[PDB]
Design a protein around this motif. Structure first.
Motif, PDB file in Angstrom:
ATOM      1  N   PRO A  98       0.828  -1.215   0.000  1.00  0.00           N
ATOM      2  CA  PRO A  98       0.000   0.000   0.000  1.00  0.00           C
ATOM      3  C   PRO A  98       0.857   1.258   0.000  1.00  0.00           C
ATOM      4  CG  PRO A  98      -0.070  -1.106   2.133  1.00  0.00           C
ATOM      5  CD  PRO A  98       0.554  -2.065   1.171  1.00  0.00           C
ATOM      6  N   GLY A  99       0.595   2.131  -0.969  1.00  0.00           N
ATOM      7  CA  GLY A  99       1.367   3.347  -1.128  1.00  0.00           C
ATOM      8  C   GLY A  99       2.422   3.239  -2.210  1.00  0.00           C
ATOM      9  N   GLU A 100       2.080   2.582  -3.319  1.00  0.00           N
ATOM     10  CA  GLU A 100       3.018   2.391  -4.419  1.00  0.00           C
ATOM     11  C   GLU A 100       2.334   2.600  -5.764  1.00  0.00           C
ATOM     12  OE1 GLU A 100       4.840  -1.418  -4.053  1.00  0.00           O
ATOM     13  OE2 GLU A 100       6.041  -0.879  -2.296  1.00  0.00           O
ATOM     14  N   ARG A 101       3.004   2.211  -6.847  1.00  0.00           N
ATOM     15  CA  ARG A 101       2.490   2.400  -8.196  1.00  0.00           C
ATOM     16  C   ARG A 101       2.510   1.076  -8.944  1.00  0.00           C
ATOM     17  NH1 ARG A 101       5.383   6.065  -9.297  1.00  0.00           N
ATOM     18  NH2 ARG A 101       3.950   7.857  -9.308  1.00  0.00           N
ATOM     19  N   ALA A 102       1.395   0.759  -9.598  1.00  0.00           N
ATOM     20  CA  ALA A 102       1.260  -0.451 -10.395  1.00  0.00           C
ATOM     21  C   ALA A 102       0.828  -0.077 -11.807  1.00  0.00           C
ATOM     22  CB  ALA A 102       0.255  -1.427  -9.769  1.00  0.00           C
ATOM     23  N   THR A 103       1.314  -0.846 -12.779  1.00  0.00           N
ATOM     24  CA  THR A 103       1.013  -0.589 -14.186  1.00  0.00           C
ATOM     25  C   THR A 103       0.614  -1.903 -14.840  1.00  0.00           C
ATOM     26  OG1 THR A 103       3.367  -0.787 -14.709  1.00  0.00           O
ATOM     27  CG2 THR A 103       2.487   1.436 -14.378  1.00  0.00           C
ATOM     28  N   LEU A 104      -0.637  -1.992 -15.285  1.00  0.00           N
ATOM     29  CA  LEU A 104      -1.145  -3.159 -15.989  1.00  0.00           C
ATOM     30  C   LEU A 104      -1.518  -2.773 -17.414  1.00  0.00           C
ATOM     31  CD1 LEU A 104      -4.850  -3.823 -15.038  1.00  0.00           C
ATOM     32  CD2 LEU A 104      -3.561  -1.993 -13.947  1.00  0.00           C
ATOM     33  N   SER A 105      -1.375  -3.728 -18.330  1.00  0.00           N
ATOM     34  CA  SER A 105      -1.626  -3.491 -19.743  1.00  0.00           C
ATOM     35  C   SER A 105      -2.597  -4.531 -20.284  1.00  0.00           C
ATOM     36  CB  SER A 105      -0.324  -3.524 -20.557  1.00  0.00           C
ATOM     37  OG  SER A 105       0.310  -4.786 -20.453  1.00  0.00           O
ATOM     38  N   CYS A 106      -3.274  -4.164 -21.374  1.00  0.00           N
ATOM     39  CA  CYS A 106      -4.229  -5.040 -22.060  1.00  0.00           C
ATOM     40  C   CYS A 106      -4.064  -4.802 -23.561  1.00  0.00           C
ATOM     41  CB  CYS A 106      -5.658  -4.781 -21.590  1.00  0.00           C
ATOM     42  SG  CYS A 106      -6.955  -5.537 -22.607  1.00  0.00           S
ATOM     43  N   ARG A 107      -3.243  -5.634 -24.197  1.00  0.00           N
ATOM     44  CA  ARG A 107      -2.949  -5.484 -25.613  1.00  0.00           C
ATOM     45  C   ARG A 107      -3.983  -6.218 -26.462  1.00  0.00           C
ATOM     46  NH1 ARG A 107      -0.507  -9.916 -27.923  1.00  0.00           N
ATOM     47  NH2 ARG A 107       0.225  -8.559 -29.622  1.00  0.00           N
ATOM     48  N   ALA A 108      -3.833  -6.090 -27.780  1.00  0.00           N
ATOM     49  CA  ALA A 108      -4.747  -6.701 -28.733  1.00  0.00           C
ATOM     50  C   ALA A 108      -3.950  -7.277 -29.893  1.00  0.00           C
ATOM     51  CB  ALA A 108      -5.785  -5.693 -29.242  1.00  0.00           C
ATOM     52  N   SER A 109      -4.613  -8.126 -30.680  1.00  0.00           N
ATOM     53  CA  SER A 109      -3.960  -8.750 -31.831  1.00  0.00           C
ATOM     54  C   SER A 109      -3.944  -7.803 -33.028  1.00  0.00           C
ATOM     55  CB  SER A 109      -4.658 -10.067 -32.179  1.00  0.00           C
ATOM     56  OG  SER A 109      -4.063 -10.677 -33.312  1.00  0.00           O
ATOM     57  N   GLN A 110      -5.126  -7.423 -33.515  1.00  0.00           N
ATOM     58  CA  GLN A 110      -5.224  -6.476 -34.619  1.00  0.00           C
ATOM     59  C   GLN A 110      -5.241  -5.048 -34.091  1.00  0.00           C
ATOM     60  OE1 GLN A 110      -6.922  -9.238 -34.321  1.00  0.00           O
ATOM     61  NE2 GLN A 110      -6.307 -10.422 -36.126  1.00  0.00           N
ATOM     62  N   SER A 111      -5.553  -4.089 -34.959  1.00  0.00           N
ATOM     63  CA  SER A 111      -5.603  -2.687 -34.577  1.00  0.00           C
ATOM     64  C   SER A 111      -7.045  -2.296 -34.295  1.00  0.00           C
ATOM     65  CB  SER A 111      -5.018  -1.785 -35.671  1.00  0.00           C
ATOM     66  OG  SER A 111      -5.732  -1.928 -36.886  1.00  0.00           O
ATOM     67  N   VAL A 112      -7.263  -1.653 -33.153  1.00  0.00           N
ATOM     68  CA  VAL A 112      -8.588  -1.207 -32.751  1.00  0.00           C
ATOM     69  C   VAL A 112      -8.603   0.314 -32.698  1.00  0.00           C
ATOM     70  CG1 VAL A 112      -9.060  -3.325 -31.483  1.00  0.00           C
ATOM     71  CG2 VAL A 112      -8.077  -1.354 -30.294  1.00  0.00           C
ATOM     72  N   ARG A 113      -9.806   0.872 -32.785  1.00  0.00           N
ATOM     73  CA  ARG A 113      -9.996   2.313 -32.760  1.00  0.00           C
ATOM     74  C   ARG A 113     -10.041   2.808 -31.321  1.00  0.00           C
ATOM     75  NH1 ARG A 113     -15.417   2.593 -36.157  1.00  0.00           N
ATOM     76  NH2 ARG A 113     -15.313   4.781 -35.474  1.00  0.00           N
ATOM     77  N   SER A 114      -9.326   3.902 -31.057  1.00  0.00           N
ATOM     78  CA  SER A 114      -9.235   4.430 -29.702  1.00  0.00           C
ATOM     79  C   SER A 114     -10.446   5.289 -29.366  1.00  0.00           C
ATOM     80  CB  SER A 114      -7.949   5.241 -29.529  1.00  0.00           C
ATOM     81  OG  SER A 114      -6.804   4.444 -29.778  1.00  0.00           O
ATOM     82  N   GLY A 115     -11.642   4.751 -29.586  1.00  0.00           N
ATOM     83  CA  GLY A 115     -12.861   5.440 -29.221  1.00  0.00           C
ATOM     84  C   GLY A 115     -13.902   4.498 -28.655  1.00  0.00           C
ATOM     85  N   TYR A 116     -13.598   3.203 -28.664  1.00  0.00           N
ATOM     86  CA  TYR A 116     -14.520   2.164 -28.228  1.00  0.00           C
ATOM     87  C   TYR A 116     -13.831   1.173 -27.299  1.00  0.00           C
ATOM     88  CZ  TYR A 116     -17.229   4.060 -32.104  1.00  0.00           C
ATOM     89  OH  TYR A 116     -17.903   4.898 -32.961  1.00  0.00           O
ATOM     90  N   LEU A 117     -13.006   1.683 -26.389  1.00  0.00           N
ATOM     91  CA  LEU A 117     -12.336   0.873 -25.384  1.00  0.00           C
ATOM     92  C   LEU A 117     -12.843   1.268 -24.004  1.00  0.00           C
ATOM     93  CD1 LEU A 117      -9.915  -1.285 -25.260  1.00  0.00           C
ATOM     94  CD2 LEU A 117      -8.599   0.641 -24.363  1.00  0.00           C
ATOM     95  N   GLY A 118     -13.039   0.274 -23.143  1.00  0.00           N
ATOM     96  CA  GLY A 118     -13.565   0.531 -21.817  1.00  0.00           C
ATOM     97  C   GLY A 118     -12.992  -0.370 -20.745  1.00  0.00           C
ATOM     98  N   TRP A 119     -12.674   0.206 -19.590  1.00  0.00           N
ATOM     99  CA  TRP A 119     -12.149  -0.533 -18.454  1.00  0.00           C
ATOM    100  C   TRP A 119     -13.231  -0.700 -17.396  1.00  0.00           C
ATOM    101  CZ3 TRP A 119      -7.463   0.012 -20.964  1.00  0.00           C
ATOM    102  CH2 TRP A 119      -6.475  -0.921 -20.624  1.00  0.00           C
ATOM    103  N   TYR A 120     -13.132  -1.788 -16.634  1.00  0.00           N
ATOM    104  CA  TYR A 120     -14.121  -2.105 -15.615  1.00  0.00           C
ATOM    105  C   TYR A 120     -13.419  -2.529 -14.333  1.00  0.00           C
ATOM    106  CZ  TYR A 120     -17.312  -2.225 -19.601  1.00  0.00           C
ATOM    107  OH  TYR A 120     -18.030  -1.910 -20.731  1.00  0.00           O
ATOM    108  N   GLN A 121     -14.161  -2.455 -13.230  1.00  0.00           N
ATOM    109  CA  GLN A 121     -13.681  -2.857 -11.919  1.00  0.00           C
ATOM    110  C   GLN A 121     -14.738  -3.717 -11.244  1.00  0.00           C
ATOM    111  OE1 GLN A 121     -12.856   0.367  -9.230  1.00  0.00           O
ATOM    112  NE2 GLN A 121     -12.177  -0.977  -7.566  1.00  0.00           N
ATOM    113  N   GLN A 122     -14.304  -4.850 -10.695  1.00  0.00           N
ATOM    114  CA  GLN A 122     -15.235  -5.814 -10.120  1.00  0.00           C
ATOM    115  C   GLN A 122     -14.655  -6.385  -8.837  1.00  0.00           C
ATOM    116  OE1 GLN A 122     -16.021  -9.219 -12.583  1.00  0.00           O
ATOM    117  NE2 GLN A 122     -17.412 -10.169 -11.100  1.00  0.00           N
TER     118      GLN A 122
END
Lengths: 215, 211, 196
Positions: B15-39
């Motif tokens: 607690p009290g640090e920095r984390a970096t997670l990534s979610c790549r893709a195979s083909q190319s997607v448009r940067s207008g229809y991407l969404g992140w969620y929390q559960q």
């Protein structure tokens, strides 16, 4: 608060029809949309299953579109979802999602979600309880352990308490597992000091709502 | 259909640090229809980031969005612990919409040692015509253990199941239970039932049994 | 005596949609509205800015005629001061309108064996239509804040859909042909009069 109300739980046989509804107030603007997702125990989300109220256009996944159908209704503002030819791999929770939309313009992302609906495919039965008397060899001095084993129960709204509810700490209730027959069986333990053994005498308390049985 | 592949499976921090997670893709997607969620496990997922640059209403100002083209990433500013949950990514741009695998974040602590407590079958269970042997492990941090039963020095398997709980709110440990379901036909013959405990924290393999 | 042309208007082979309605200007003839063959399927008759009893005693300059095909439960939207979808995105009348609105049943022509798809109507648009305006644009509609780039998707839809006319239906889904007449009178040598 703007939320989406859903239906209650339901248990079905291996092969039948099922219907889940999703009622809301924003579903009467000729521009609203709603998707359907499914999540099993541990497994991630599954699919899209979306529909646009107005110019009704459906678009399903690849595994589906042979046994699923989605309908819409603007009069009451309730969406529907039907899944026929049910097998014993569809036991999961189903969700409802839809964006906030006016009568002329929508949003740019899925904001409002729902609650969930549990679907189970099996037979029915009645619960049972069994003791788990403490062993005198596992005690190491002031550190003992004991519990109670629950077996043979089909529904899983099961709750377990200790000391007639006059106990909060030292409780570790493990989740339930599915046996080969079709009945679940969980287990719970309590960590009390060995010095209290032979001095504090008590038992365990359980409860099953669809059977109303307590010991 | 476009497939998403989140690389970091598990990421333990403090607690009290920095984390970096990534979610790549195979083909190319448009940067207008991407969404992140929390559960949170046992609840309903909510929206966190839409459009890969914009935040949702009410979300604190510590979740920053970045990435474009083929690689997207989510950066955490300051870990004030209320958000050790699973995160997902979605791409609603083409006709088949897909999700991600899942990235869980846990808390780091010192390696502890589990405690062994074995229990013989019950008398009422034997009178009913069944039997079960339970071997409990409590208070161990590393969520990677393995228990191999020793029934009369014969390596058994298959007829065993394990259930693990989540992390606590005081020390963030785990507890493991394992049942050995057998009938009375094999209970009156065999009498030695050992519970071999092999863990990374335990230097010497502890083994308890009975008769 | 040189009657007005109303045969091809009321007895045409095929009509048009509601978003692409036709407009024919009738002039230089005598208004002889008694030869409409009674419009056998019990045509209705409602006039707002003129009287049905005595109207043949007025000489107008030009008379416009519009024609389209709509459903049964939407004929009440062709009137001054009406809201909806076929009264705000397809066809709208002004507040002071002088003319009549005619409509009759056409369930025996605009229906075929198990499904007929050849009539469209606009569903999405940016703003409301001003009186007497026709739009035949077939572009994509944005319902959010991101560009569409000419492809249907999440927040980008298509503004046209069909009607699905079928023979076996209710009395509120059968097609009805509507003809709207508008009278015009200005400082011109008016020649369109009645029988006189």
């Amino acid at each position: 608060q703007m939320q989406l109300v859903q239906s209650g739980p339901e248990v079905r046989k291996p092969g039948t029809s099922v219907k889940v509804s999703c009622r809301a107030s924003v579903f009467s603007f000729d521009t609203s949309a709603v998707q359907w997702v499914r999540q099993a125990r541990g497994q991630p989300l599954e699919w899209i299953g979306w529909i646009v109220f107005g110019s009704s256009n459906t678009d399903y996944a690849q595994k589906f579109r042979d046994r699923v159908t989605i309908t819409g209704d603007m009069s009451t503002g309730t969406a529907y979802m039907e899944l026929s030819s049910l097998r014993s791999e569809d036991t999961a929770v189903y969700y409802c999602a839809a964006p906030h939309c006016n009568r002329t313009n929508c949003h740019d992302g899925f904001d409002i979600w729902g609650q969930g609906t549990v679907v189970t495919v099996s037979s029915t039965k009645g619960p049972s309880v069994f003791p788990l008397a403490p062993s005198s060899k596992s005690t190491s001095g002031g550190t003992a352990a004991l519990g109670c084993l629950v077996k043979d129960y089909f529904p899983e709204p099961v709750t377990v308490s200790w000391n007639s509810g006059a106990l909060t700490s030292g409780v570790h209730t493990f989740p339930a597992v599915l046996q080969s027959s079709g009945l679940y069986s969980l287990s719970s333990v309590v960590t009390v000091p060995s010095s209290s053994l032979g001095t504090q005498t008590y038992i365990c308390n359980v409860n099953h709502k669809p059977s109303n049985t307590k010991v | 259909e476009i497939v998403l592949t989140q690389s970091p499976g598990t990421l333990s921090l403090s607690p009290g640090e920095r984390a970096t997670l990534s979610c790549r893709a195979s083909q190319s997607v448009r940067s207008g229809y991407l969404g992140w969620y929390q559960q949170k496990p046992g609840q309903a997922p909510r929206l966190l980031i839409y459009g890969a640059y914009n935040r949702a209403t009410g979300i604190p100002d510590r979740f920053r969005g970045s990435g474009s083209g083929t690689d997207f990433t989510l950066t955490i500013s300051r870990l004030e612990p209320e958000d050790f949950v699973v995160y997902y990514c979605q791409q609603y741009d083409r006709s088949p919409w897909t999700f991600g695998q899942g990235t869980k974040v846990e808390i780091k602590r010192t390696v502890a040692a589990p405690s062994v407590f074995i229990f013989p079958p019950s008398d009422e269970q034997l009178k009913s015509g069944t039997a079960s042997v339970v071997c409990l492990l409590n208070n161990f941090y590393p969520r990677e253990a393995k228990v191999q039963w020793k029934v009369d020095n014969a390596l058994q398997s298959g007829n065993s199941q394990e259930s693990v709980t989540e992390q606590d709110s005081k020390d963030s440990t785990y507890s493991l239970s394992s049942t050995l379901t057998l009938s009375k036909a094999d209970y009156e013959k065999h009498k030695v039932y050992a519970c071999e405990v092999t863990h990374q924290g335990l230097s010497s393999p502890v083994t308890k049994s009975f008769n | 005596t040189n009657l007005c042309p109303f045969d091809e208007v009321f007895n045409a082979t095929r009509f048009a949609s509601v978003y692409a309605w036709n407009r024919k200007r009738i002039s230089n003839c005598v208004a002889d509205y008694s030869v409409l063959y009674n419009l056998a399927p019990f045509f209705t008759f409602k006039c707002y800015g003129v009287s049905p009893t005595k109207l043949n005693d007025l000489c107008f300059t030009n008379v416009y005629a519009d024609s389209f095909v709509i459903r049964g439960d939407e004929v009440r939207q062709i009137a001054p001061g009406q809201t909806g979808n076929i009264a705000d995105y397809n066809y709208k009348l002004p507040d002071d309108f002088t003319g009549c609105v005619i409509a009759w049943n056409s369930n025996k022509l605009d229906s075929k064996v198990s499904g007929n798809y050849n009539y469209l109507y606009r569903l999405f648009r940016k703003s409301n239509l001003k009186p007497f305006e026709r739009d035949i644009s077939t572009e994509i509609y944005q319902a959010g804040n991101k560009p569409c780039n000419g492809v249907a998707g999440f927040n980008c839809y298509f503004p046209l859909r069909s009607y699905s006319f079928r023979p076996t239906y209710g009395v509120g889904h059968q097609p009805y042909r509507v003809v709207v007449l508008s009278f015009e009178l200005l400082h011109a040598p008016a020649t369109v009069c009645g029988p006189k």
